[PDB]
C-alpha cells in the first residue's frame, strides 16, 4: 500500500439564489424584488428601483414586463392598471 493526498482544491462558496423571482405578466406588490443579480445583467425601468446589492424591486403594485434597451441590453418595468 501507498500514501498520498494534498488536493487543496476542495471548497466553494455558498450558493446565492440569484436570477429572476417574478415573471412577466405577473402581478406584483410594492417593494417586491424581481431579479437578484451582481452588477447589471438587467437594468431597472419604470416604477422600478435598484439597491445597493444591484437588486431590482418594484416601487409600486402592478404587472411586470421585461424589454430591451435597444440593443444587447435588457430592462424590466412595472406598469399598473
Amino acid at each position: 500500500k501507498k500514501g498520498v493526498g494534498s488536493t487543496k482544491n476542495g471548497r466553494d462558496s455558498e450558493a446565492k439564489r440569484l436570477g429572476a423571482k417574478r415573471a412577466d405578466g405577473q402581478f406584483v406588490t410594492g417593494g417586491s424584488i424581481l431579479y437578484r443579480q451582481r452588477g447589471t445583467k438587467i437594468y431597472p425601468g419604470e416604477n422600478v428601483g435598484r439597491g445597493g446589492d444591484d437588486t431590482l424591486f418594484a416601487k409600486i403594485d402592478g404587472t411586470v414586463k421585461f424589454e430591451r434597451f435597444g440593443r444587447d441590453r435588457k430592462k424590466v418595468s412595472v406598469y399598473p392598471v
Binding site: 500500500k1 501507498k2 498520498v4 493526498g5 494534498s6 488536493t7 482544491n9
Partner: protein, 135 residues
Amino acid sequence: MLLPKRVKYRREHRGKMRGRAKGGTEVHFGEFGIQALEASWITNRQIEAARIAMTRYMKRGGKVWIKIFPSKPYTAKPLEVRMGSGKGAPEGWVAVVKPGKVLFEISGVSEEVAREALRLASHKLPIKTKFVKRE
C-alpha cells in the same frame, strides 16, 4: 513529441467524442490526404511515429501538413493506489478526433507513393481510415 508550450489548466475533463468533426474534413493544403472513420484520442508519440514513417518512405517528398495538435492533456494516477485523494498527475498530451476528420495531408508526390505512406501511418494509428484527395 509535440507539446503545447503553455496552458491555462494542466488538468481537464476528458470529454465526449460524439458526432462528426467541425472542420478539417477535406484536404485543402495538400493533394492526397487521409481521414478517419471513427473517433478516438491520439498521442504525440503516435503522430510522430506516423510522421517519421511517411517521411522515411518518401525520403525527400514534398510537404505533409499534419492537421491536428495534441492540445489536450491526460492524467494518470501513480501505480498501485487507492481511489480518491485528488486528481492524478498529467502524463502526456492528446489530440481528440472525430470521424470525417483529416489527419495528414500530402503534396509534391504521386498518388501511389502517397497512398502507401498513408497506409504505413494508418498501421501506426489505432483507428480506421480512408484515403482521400482534393476536389
